[PDB]
Structures are given as structure tokens and as C-alpha cells.
Design a protein around this ligand. Structure first.
Ligand code: NA
Ligand code: NA
Ligand code: NA
Ligand code: NA
Lengths: 74, 385
């Protein structure tokens, strides 16, 4: 009753995913946190992120369309 | 509700350095709501950023706009998909003229179609699809303000993702057949996640199932909202501590390969026992060409015992079983792998993720409300070789 037999299909792949199939984002709103530079310097954060390589890191979100590059800003 | 803010070169630099030093490939979304008086994207600000990044030698891929389907509500302006495609063609020309070594362009980052078709996506792909390297769309199962634990455990909720994928893939196949399709921003619940739920072990059913179905249905890349940040769906909290979905993701990364196969249950499928099958990730030094990685979800309230089909029935299997740690049960923010709580060894050291070898020939025990990876060793699957 609680035993479940599985059928497998293995003769050839149905699809190929990217090596970076499991990727991640940073929401664009994080760039409004005054601590942004310090936060992304965390050694713990870097170690955790390296664990997910290879991956894309997408910087975006609603704030994508409400952010302006200012080349004179410190 | 949103107003504009500025960002600096230093912010770009730190973001790029974070990605590079972590072995990640940065995709940067450009602002699509800078418009000319004749209704076109104004590329002036992006040009400054592209020039800056090129001068620094940064290898960055690009997007333009986020969820353009909601520009009318969020910003009081309607940009149709044909116009957005024209804007993407302009951005493509700027990337071609730059010194970037073959920067890629992804878009249009539309929201999920819900109960409608993907109309803006279709018009965008007709107009601008030739210049994008992959189609991006977004998905959330539920509203974080109202989601409950029951919802996070509900196979009917999980199954709603299938129809969303089908609708998007239909539009892509009808306009740009074969173009790669990516989830460009996705998680359990919108509105910043469901408090007390999106950061728990219980969030893992939606995350693992989404990965399994995405792979099975032809999505090539899935981008988890968010690695780190304010939302409850973060993989890492703002104390920099990994939540259960981080550990789930790390195990997935280490065990699941790129070749997608298929598994299914024999007999009645109540949709609570959900199974996925890939070749094992060859980069893992424990394993070898031909090995299989089965991953499985049990949303029943009792243990289920999985029996593998011949010739895998009597192979050596390595178990990686995840269960919540502590009195919060499924609402815990800590998780155990084969009975050992997963925690960093120190700030620079991930723990070993050790398998539990099972007795060859034994059925795979999957406890109630759990998920696991099983590596079938010496599977010698030619398709994995
Ligand atoms: Na994002
Ligand atoms: Na799902
Ligand atoms: Na994206
Ligand atoms: Na954030």
C-alpha cells in the first residue's frame, strides 16, 4: 500500500539544461540599501555564493526601471 | 509608489566583484522607463554604464526592463511589445558596437500569464526576438500576504506551475521556435515572500518541484528570487545565515546533472509522490559517467517506499534525505541531511554533504513531508555516458 514502483525512461535525454540551471538573483532594490558595498563584501556571503557556482546572478526587479546610473556619485 | 534612485560606479564595481569572486556570471537589468518624447527607449544613461563597464573590462550580460506588462500600473505609461522589441534591437546595436566580448541580451522579463495568454510576450518576440539569446519570464505560486502552510504542501498549487509553463512555451514556439526559455525571477510567493513560510523547510517543496518540472518541460535556466536580500524568500538571511532552501540548492547543484531523464510512478498518481530523474552531475568526484540522480518529494502524511525498476533495482544507492531540524517541524529554519544538522564549519567553509549508502536492493524510504536525492551508482546508463 505504501510501496511505489517507479518507471524510468533513460534511453536518451528529454532536454539538456544549462550547467547554470540553478541560478539566483539579487533584487535591484538592494542597491538602495546604504550598506550595499559592505553587505556584498561579507566573507560568509561569498563562501555561500561560491557553493552555487556555476550560476548566473541576475541583478534586477521592479526597481530596475527606477534606477539611474550617476557616474559622478561617490 | 516607486520613485527613482541613483547608483554609483562603486556599486557596479562591488556587484561585479561579488559575482566574479564567487564564480557567478552577472546579468544586469537596464532601466526601460527612460523614454524619448516620441515614445522610444532613451539609451543615454545605459550608454554611460556600458562605456564604464567596457572601460573596466567587465564581462556582463544585459536585460532591459522588468515586468513591462505592468508598466501602465507601476509608472503610468504603456509600452507595447512591438515597441519594446524595437528598444531591444537598439540595445543590441549598442552591445555590438561596444568592446564587450560577445555580451548576451535576455528579455523581456514578463510576469507570468496567469489566466490569460502571454500577449505582450508574443508581440515582443515577433518584433525583437531575433536579438535576444534567451526569453525570460517570471513566476510565483501565491500571494505572500495570504499564503498558508497548507498551500505550500498542496499538490494542486504545485501543479498550477505546469499550465503557466505550457502557456509561455506555446508563445515561444509560435514565434521563435527553439529559442531558449529561462525563468528570470521566480520563487514561492510574491510580495516579498510569505512571512514564516518562504524561509522555512516547507518552502523546499515548491523550490525542488519547480526545478524538477522546469527541467522536464524545457526551461534551461531558473533564477531564484533571491540569493540574499530583504524578502522572506531569500536563500540567505541578512545575518548571512543559510536557510533550508540554500542547503537544498547546494545539494541540487552538487548532485543533479544537465541531462534530463524521466521517472514516473506506476499506477494511481495522486500527485503527492513526485519524482524527477537526471544523469548525475559529472563534476561530483564521488560519482562516475552513467550514474543517475533521482530526486523525490513526498507530500503524503505517511512514509512511502520507492522501488527502482530493473536494472537499477539492486544497484548501490546513496541517500541524501532532508528533514527539518527542531520543534518547529516543517516551519523550521534549520535542516538535517541524513540526521545531521547542516551548518557552516566557519565563515569560509561549507560542511561536507555526506551520502548515506543504503543496502543494495532495499526500497527507498521517503518519510512523510520530505524530499531527497538518491544517486544510483554504477547505473551505467549509456545516455549519461
Ligand atoms: Na531579481
Ligand atoms: Na510546481
Ligand atoms: Na531575468
Ligand atoms: Na532586497
Amino acid at each position: 500500500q505504501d510501496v511505489v514502483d517507479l518507471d524510468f525512461f533513460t534511453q536518451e535525454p528529454l532536454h539538456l539544461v544549462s550547467p547554470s540551471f540553478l541560478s539566483v538573483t539579487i533584487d535591484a532594490n538592494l542597491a538602495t540599501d546604504p550598506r550595499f558595498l559592505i553587505l556584498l563584501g561579507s566573507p560568509k556571503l561569498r563562501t555561500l555564493a561560491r557553493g552555487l557556482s556555476p550560476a548566473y546572478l541576475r541583478f534586477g526587479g521592479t526597481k530596475t526601471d527606477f534606477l539611474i546610473f550617476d557616474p559622478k556619485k561617490e | 509608489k516607486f520613485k527613482n534612485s541613483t547608483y554609483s560606479r562603486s556599486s557596479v564595481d562591488v556587484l561585479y566583484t561579488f559575482a566574479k569572486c564567487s564564480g557567478l556570471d552577472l546579468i544586469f537589468g537596464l532601466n526601460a522607463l527612460l523614454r524619448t518624447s516620441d515614445g522610444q527607449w532613451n539609451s543615454s544613461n545605459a550608454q554611460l554604464l556600458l562605456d564604464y563597464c567596457a572601460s573596466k573590462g567587465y564581462n556582463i550580460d544585459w536585460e532591459l526592463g522588468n515586468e513591462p506588462n505592468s508598466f501602465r500600473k507601476k509608472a503610468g505609461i504603456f509600452i507595447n511589445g512591438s515597441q519594446l522589441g524595437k528598444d531591444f534591437i537598439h540595445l543590441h546595436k549598442l552591445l555590438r558596437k561596444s568592446t564587450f566580448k560577445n555580451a548576451k541580451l535576455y528579455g523581456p522579463d514578463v510576469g507570468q500569464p496567469r489566466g490569460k495568454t502571454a500577449k505582450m510576450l508574443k508581440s515582443f518576440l515577433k518584433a525583437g526576438g531575433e536579438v535576444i539569446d534567451a526569453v525570460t519570464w517570471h513566476h510565483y505560486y501565491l500571494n505572500g500576504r495570504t499564503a498558508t502552510l497548507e498551500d505550500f504542501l498542496n499538490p494542486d498549487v504545485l501543479d498550477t506551475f505546469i499550465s503557466q509553463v505550457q502557456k509561455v512555451l506555446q508563445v515561444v514556439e509560435s514565434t521563435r521556435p527553439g529559442k531558449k526559455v529561462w525563468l528570470g525571477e521566480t520563487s514561492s510567493a510574491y510580495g516579498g515572500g510569505a512571512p514564516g513560510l518562504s524561509d522555512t523547510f516547507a518552502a523546499g517543496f515548491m523550490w525542488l518541484d519547480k526545478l524538477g518540472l522546469s527541467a522536464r518541460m524545457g526551461i534551461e535556466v531558473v533564477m531564484r528570487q533571491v540569493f540574499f536580500g530583504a524578502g522572506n524568500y531569500h536563500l540567505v538571511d541578512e545575518n548571512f545565515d543559510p536557510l533550508p532552501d540554500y542547503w537544498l540548492s547546494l545539494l541540487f547543484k552538487k548532485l543533479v546533472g544537465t541531462k534530463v531523464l524521466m521517472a514516473s510512478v506506476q499506477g494511481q498518481d495522486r500527485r503527492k509522490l513526485r519524482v524527477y530523474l537526471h544523469c548525475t552531475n559529472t563534476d561530483n568526484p564521488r560519482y562516475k559517467e552513467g550514474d543517475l540522480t533521482l530526486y523525490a518529494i513526498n507530500l503524503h502524511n505517511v512514509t512511502k517506499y520507492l522501488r527502482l525498476p530493473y536494472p537499477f533495482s539492486n544497484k548501490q544507492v546513496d541517500q541524501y534525505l532532508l528533514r527539518p531540524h527542531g520543534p518547529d517541524g516543517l516551519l523550521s529554519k534549520s535542516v538535517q541531511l541524513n540526521g545531521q544538522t547542516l551548518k557552516m564549519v566557519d565563515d569560509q567553509t561549507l560542511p561536507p554533504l555526506k551520502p548515506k549508502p543504503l543496502r543494495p536492493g532495499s526500497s527507498l524510504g521517503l518519510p512523510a513531508f520530505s524530499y531527497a536525492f538518491f544517486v544510483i551508482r554504477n547505473a551505467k546508463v549509456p545516455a549519461c555516458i
